Design a protein around this ligand. Structure first.
Ligand SMILES: O=c1ccn([C@@H]2O[C@H](COP(=O)(O)OP(=O)(O)NP(=O)(O)O)[C@@H](O)[C@H]2O)c(=O)[nH]1
Ligand SMILES: O=c1ccn([C@@H]2O[C@H](COP(=O)(O)OP(=O)(O)NP(=O)(O)O)[C@@H](O)[C@H]2O)c(=O)[nH]1
Ligand SMILES: [Cl-]
Ligand SMILES: [Cl-]
Ligand SMILES: [Mg+2]
Ligand SMILES: [Mg+2]
Lengths: 359, 357
């Protein structure tokens, strides 16, 4: 990297306005013979909490939020894409509109940032960007591939799944995307499940004693009595009896097998805790469930809490181990012993590189 | 100045969608039990306390807006939060109460007695006491069973008379003595089954929205209240097992009269629905949601009724109340459910006046 890379390269800002927080990335890039970006490098990032959708939208709060996100960036005179995800999708269009009317007006009132788009993207667009971002990092877009790469984004309010699949005229057009990038034609299945993100999902199980460490104080006054297999079956009832995840995904995956699975999102936070024993930044669902069951569900809450003072979301780790297995194995039909790669969390990798490539 | 001649306290319902301050004046009978409760002031503010960022500046702005313009002060305050705070871990709730405690210590107008998150079962007891105080049924021994439901944003409560039972958790039973009668109640709260929390599992269900309503995933609504109700029932019973927990108990301890408070009173009194005498049946609620919202064209309907911010959810909400009351609790679809007119702003706060534990 150069000092002041944006005097030497094209630059763009992309903001992931996620359910739990917003992340500003600034990317420098060059472009190949077709004006497609290459050599993408992240030259700045800043993450703030809470989520954009969680603020009261008037001109004071919106100014304070965008100031906190944007003011100390090292360059401002570049195009901005502000793309919100599932936290904004939980709100009706009439309510979302107040947010964007205020945001638009704030960008019109300054003379540096060049707002190109500010809008809520569908879960299907979010899954397209998930797949592009990951495969860009793996260097698999340049040439046609011997192996199928699938991507899962395990977020706070929705989850996405995306994998190669030839065009199928019996599947909704909303769940399929064709793109041509770097001279290759790629066809993907995309799907997002609103409400199955970890924050939303957890609000249906807070009083389940099987989903918390022993003696954890549940909100209703009862005590935790953890057991990950029991917790996992309760979550599977939300996955399949309510959302029909298995009926939608499994017939497609069985016919379009994925050779390598990569996950991003808040799963990498869990998988990186020292309560767990994983090598090579990968896990399997069977090991996750077994280790969550032994190291968390069946331990005494007070002991655990004193022992891991740096795990802020520690109290949910029995529930999350259970949920990820319910989602991936009972929902998507992934084999419990199949390797799932996770990107280390210090990398802060989200779907934003996909916007650089796709616009 | 009523607080010079009567006992006054302030009770704050810190609900998931907002906070309500009530100031009650009362006298006491010869057991020191309150009588002649009168509400002398209320103020409702939004959003919910649990939705704000807990720091000193934001907490001061919020408590100032709730309390400052009250016509009477120098009285005891009970601040009790409900399901919005229960959705957060203790570790995170503690930040709110540390800041709130500091705010009250840094002023002189209000005497803070308690500020805490109450369980859903405490909230269900208060629900029952408030409604029965209003109906005047607490004074003497009733020959009728009165059941109360509070249909909130993040949780829902159900509570009805039930003799003390060694097989049911002690957390789900309450015994109290009031006005020299002994009363035993079953109480249950379902966290996550409030209207806001439940709705986040169904926003991409076409059956739950008017025709052509733009679902967040890009598909179109295609409303059908019976199909929506069936989807909501899988959350009620396959996930939460509401039917398994409640129906055997109501079968053995039938309720003669049902009252409902909470957000359902807003839906029943809206311009889209037609009910007389402040009561409804589940059969009529589902049918009106189906015909007046579900089976309508969204653009047309939305343009007809611009003043109802909640209109778009009415197909889902009518279907959900049916799924919860009929398929969950086992209530007959033709059974009358009384609701309190929403302009009365009745919540469970009168319960705290009557019962401080
Ligand atoms: O690799 C990562 C992924 C997530 N995180 C952090 O974990 C938290 C959860 O992010 P997330 O992927 O779990 O949820 P999200 O907010 O993007 N929610 P959604 O995608 O809108 O549903 C955030 O604080 C995020 O910055 C990392 O630190 N590193
Ligand atoms: O009778 C009523 C009941 C509720 N409301 C209002 O509807 C909104 C929803 O209140 P609610 O009872 O549905 O939910 P709540 O915020 O108490 N949520 P919870 O009880 O914490 O789960 C609030 O603005 C409330 O003041 C009335 O105006 N009148
Ligand atoms: Cl509770
Ligand atoms: Cl979506
Ligand atoms: Mg995300
Ligand atoms: Mg309430």
């Amino acid at each position: 990297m150069d000092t002041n890379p944006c005097e030497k390269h094209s630059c763009i800002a992309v903001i992931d306005a996620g359910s739990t927080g917003s992340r500003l990335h600034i990317y420098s890039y060059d472009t190949d013979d077709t004006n497609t970006p290459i050599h993408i490098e992240e030259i700045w990032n800043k993450k703030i909490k809470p989520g954009f959708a969680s603020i009261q939208p008037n001109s004071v709060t919106i100014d304070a939020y965008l100031t906190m996100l944007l003011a100390d960036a090292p360059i401002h005179n570049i195009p901005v894409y502000f793309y919100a995800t599932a936290g904004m999708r939980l709100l009706p269009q009439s309510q979302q509109k107040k947010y964007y009317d205020e945001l638009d007006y704030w960008f019109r009132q300054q003379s540096q940032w060049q707002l190109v788009e500010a809008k809520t993207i569908t879960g299907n667009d979010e899954a397209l960007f998930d797949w592009l971002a990951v495969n860009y990092k793996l260097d698999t877009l340049k040439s046609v591939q011997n192996k199928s790469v699938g991507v899962m984004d395990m977020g706070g309010a929705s989850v996405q799944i995306v994998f190669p699949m030839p065009k199928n005229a019996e599947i909704s057009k909303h769940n399929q995307v064709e793109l041509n990038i770097y001279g290759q034609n790629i066809n993907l299945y995309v799907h997002s499940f609103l409400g199955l993100g970890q924050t939303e999902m957890s609000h249906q199980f807070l009083n389940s004693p099987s989903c918390f460490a022993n003696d954890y104080p549940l909100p209703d006054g009862e005590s935790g009595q953890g057991n990950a297999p029991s917790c996992k079956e309760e979550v599977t009832s939300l996955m399949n009896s309510v959302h029909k995840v298995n009926q939608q995904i499994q017939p497609l995956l069985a016919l379009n097998p994925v050779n390598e699975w990569y996950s991003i999102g808040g799963i990498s936070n869990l998988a990186s805790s020292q309560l767990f024993h994983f090598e090579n930044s990968e896990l399997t669902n069977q090991s996750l469930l077994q280790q969550g069951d032994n190291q968390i569900c069946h331990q005494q809450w007070d002991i655990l809490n004193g022992q891991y003072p740096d795990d802020e979301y520690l109290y949910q780790y029995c529930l999350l181990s259970s949920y990820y297995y319910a989602l991936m194995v009972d929902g998507y039909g992934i084999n419990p012993n199949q390797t799932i790669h996770y990107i280390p969390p210090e990398q802060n990798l989200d779907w934003t590189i996909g916007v650089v490539l796709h616009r």
